[PDB]
């Protein structure tokens, strides 16, 4: 062998023949020779496949066993591991090796040093990050910086890898609801991080995670026993019990304002959305008046929070929004047609923002019901024209409008005729192009690019989309938009079938 050969100044005789086999002979000489030979045969791939051959043989080692008893590691393993972690495949491998045997002093002790030594972004740290404080805080800093510079689209991409880390236990959740709340309380960009905090809270609500007990004490809404106790039962139970609504109604109406952020919690307003805008919700007159008053109060008043004092209130816009919510409630609950006759005032209610997601949810609970398109006969259903007006008047609902609308586009209505199925898809594409004119450009075209390049949807719908887009838009064009749109027309499954000349003339000038 290399070590068991001449143990003494000979040393076994059988091992001296074993020494002839390896030593500085073929095992060592031909290593450099073939390392230069496979290189000369073709090659940077040679060292990569060499490392792959080593890496496969590395994994067999029993690292968690022998490393526990040492307890010292000669000062953070400087001889061999400290130079090793600077290697990409090795440092990546160490994360894989840790997952095999967790709950060990050696592995959790060693990982605390590599996180700050160059591996700022610790990939596949779903469970390993939870055990160590330093690594968890470091990767949280990386996550918050990444989401902050990512913009808006990355929120879909940033949610799963980041928020799932707090699912192992609540102790990793309330701490992950602490420092960024301090960042949110400041006036210097305190809105966006509270936005991602509430988004995390809503994901917690749809993953069964209990977020109803911690977010109320975090927005200093626990200052009053009645307010916190009232809201706690609503968010924990998930319903509009009358007692809490009555105390809130008689509380906030008095000259003692609670913190405005407690009545503006998105989970609470989404709960109101679900409880009220459903067609099948039947409420008496008085409780309905209190409900519409709470929503109007939650969406009208401007308040100056000086942390000890506040003197500001508005009543007129509260009354106007109460009227709008009440009238839309009447339209939603009555359901009968005379639906077309009610658009004289319904678009006036569309102009108010608080009503827009209400009718959006009502439309979602209407169109998603099967046979609705089968029961419909118009060239364009009135509900989709309502979403067109919603897209026109406002832009904050555009991700939600697109999410509902692609949910409809991907849907198969087997009960319908095939040609009316296509005409329904073309109607949804008419909403796509309408929303494209209202500023929601990149996510829609990204959906189209995914649906065409990857999926196998009908090419006629894509062709109708491109024709409508080219016929509705005019130059100038931004470089990102032409960067996204141009591979569609270059697919050649569309170009030969029929604006096109103008677009190809302008795009080459653009790039």
């Amino acid at each position: 062998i290399m070590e068991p050969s001449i143990f003494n100044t000979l040393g076994s005789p059988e091992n001296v023949i074993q020494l002839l086999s390896e030593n500085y002979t073929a095992v060592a000489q031909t290593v450099n020779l073939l390392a230069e030979w496979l290189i000369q045969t073709g090659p940077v791939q040679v060292q990569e496949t060499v490392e792959n051959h080593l890496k496969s043989l590395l994994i067999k080692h029993f690292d968690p066993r022998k490393a526990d008893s040492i307890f010292t590691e000669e000062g953070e393993t400087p001889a061999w591991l400290e130079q090793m972690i600077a290697h990409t495949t090795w440092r990546d491998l160490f994360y894989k090796l840790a997952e095999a045997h967790p709950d060990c002093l050696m592995l959790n002790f060693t990982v605390k040093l590599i996180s700050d030594a160059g591996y700022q972004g610790e990939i596949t740290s779903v469970s390993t990050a939870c055990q160590q404080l330093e690594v968890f805080s470091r990767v949280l800093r990386t996550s918050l910086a990444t989401i902050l510079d990512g913009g808006e689209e990355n929120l879909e991409k940033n949610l799963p890898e980041f928020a799932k880390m707090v699912c192992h236990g609540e102790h990793t959740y309330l701490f992950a609801q602490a420092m960024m709340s301090v960042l949110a309380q400041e006036e210097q960009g305190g809105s966006a991080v509270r936005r991602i905090a509430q988004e995390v809270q809503r994901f917690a609500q749809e993953k069964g995670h209990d977020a109803s007990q911690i977010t109320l004490a975090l927005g200093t809404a626990a200052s009053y026993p009645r307010a916190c106790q009232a809201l706690g039962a609503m968010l924990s139970k998930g319903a509009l019990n009358p007692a809490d609504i009555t105390v809130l109604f008689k509380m906030f109406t008095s000259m003692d304002p609670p913190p405005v952020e407690l009545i503006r919690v998105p989970a609470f307003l989404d709960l109101f959305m679900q409880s009220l805008f459903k067609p099948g919700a039947r409420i008496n007159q008085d409780h309905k008046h209190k409900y519409i008053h709470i929503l109007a109060y939650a969406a009208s008043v401007v308040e100056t929070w000086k942390k000890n004092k506040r003197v500001s209130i508005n009543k007129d816009e509260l009354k106007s929004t109460s009227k709008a919510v009440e009238t839309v409630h009447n339209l939603c609950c009555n359901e009968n047609s005379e639906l077309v006759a009610e658009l004289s005032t319904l678009y006036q209610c569309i102009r108010f923002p608080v009503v827009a997601m209400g009718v959006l949810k009502w439309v979602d609970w209407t169109v998603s019901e099967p046979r609705y398109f089968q029961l419909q006969t118009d060239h364009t259903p009135v509900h989709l024209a309502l979403l067109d007006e919603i897209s026109t008047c406002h832009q904050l609902l555009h991700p939600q409008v697109l999410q509902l609308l692609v949910k409809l586009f991907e849907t198969e209505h087997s009960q319908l005729d095939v040609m009316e199925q296509l005409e329904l898809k073309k109607t949804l594409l008419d909403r796509m192009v309408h929303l494209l004119s209202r500023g929601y450009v990149l996510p829609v075209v990204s959906y189209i690019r995914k649906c065409l390049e990857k999926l196998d949807t009908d090419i006629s719908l894509i062709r109708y989309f491109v024709t409508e887009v080219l016929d509705v838009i005019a130059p100038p064009y931004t470089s990102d938009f032409v960067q996204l749109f141009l591979p569609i027309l270059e697919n050649d499954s569309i170009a030969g079938t029929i604006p096109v000349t103008e677009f190809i003339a302008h795009c080459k000038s653009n790039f």
Binding site: S337, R371, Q374, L375, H379, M419, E423
Partner: protein, 240 residues
């Protein structure tokens, strides 16, 4: 069709569904009376399902006595929810709707046409396959005799009360019908005044008739769903 041509029918089928329910508990004397209509009985009275306070046997025990030898089956009852086999309680049925026979014993499940009728893979089919033909003949006769003699106790009828529903259900039926007639009137107005656009692949009469048929089919489906949802477990139409 490689399935049994003959199976349990009518009175015996309804009564064996009513018999294998989880709530059926038989007194001692009733068990004595039923046990002697078994031609294949070994003469050993089984230990009761419930010993104290009162000795009560279940219909599953008696049907386990009827089932011959050690045939093994899994069958799905008609009222079995589809989502039950995905979530919790998948193999401990809250509805007793998963039939599994293990070692020739009905450990759980309610029996119907899907497990005792002509369908392939039913209890009689595997009983024939695993135990010849004479054993299955005895199986048929034992089911009929025991189940009819228990139907003397349970009884089974049908009447006017099973064809009626409360005021709420009839109000819902009338509202659904009224809305359907309103939709048909609206479609008629659209066709007459020419707001209605013909769909491709057919003429204007075909489009109008297809839409009317869709509306009335939706009305029938909704009314049937409302009526069935309004039924009670004691409804005899539902039992049949």
């Amino acid at each position: 069709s490689n399935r049994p041509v003959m199976g349990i029918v009518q009175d015996t089928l309804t009564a064996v569904r009513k018999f294998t329910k989880r709530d059926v508990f038989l007194e001692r004397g009733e068990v004595m009376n039923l046990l002697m209509f078994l031609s294949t009985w070994d003469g050993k009275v089984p230990q009761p399902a419930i010993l104290k306070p009162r000795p009560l046997w279940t219909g599953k025990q008696i049907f386990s006595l009827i089932i011959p030898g050690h045939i093994n089956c899994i069958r799905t009852h008609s009222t079995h929810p589809d989502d039950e086999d995905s979530g919790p309680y998948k193999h401990i049925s809250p509805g007793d709707t998963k039939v599994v026979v293990e070692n020739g014993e009905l450990i759980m499940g309610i029996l119907c046409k899907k497990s005792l009728g002509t369908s392939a893979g039913s209890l009689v089919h595997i009983s024939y396959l695993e135990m010849g033909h004479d054993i299955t003949r005895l199986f048929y006769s034992n089911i009929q005799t025991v189940i009819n003699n228990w139907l003397l106790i349970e009884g089974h009828t049908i009447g006017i009360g099973d064809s009626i529903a409360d005021s709420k259900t009839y109000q819902d039926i009338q509202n659904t019908i009224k809305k359907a007639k309103q939709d048909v009137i609206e479609v008629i107005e659209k066709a007459h005044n020419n707001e209605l656009e013909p769909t491709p692949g057919n003429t204007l009469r075909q489009t109008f008739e297809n839409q009317v048929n869709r509306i009335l089919n939706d009305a029938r489906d909704k009314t049937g769903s409302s009526a069935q949802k309004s039924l009670s477990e004691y409804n005899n139409f539902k039992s049949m």
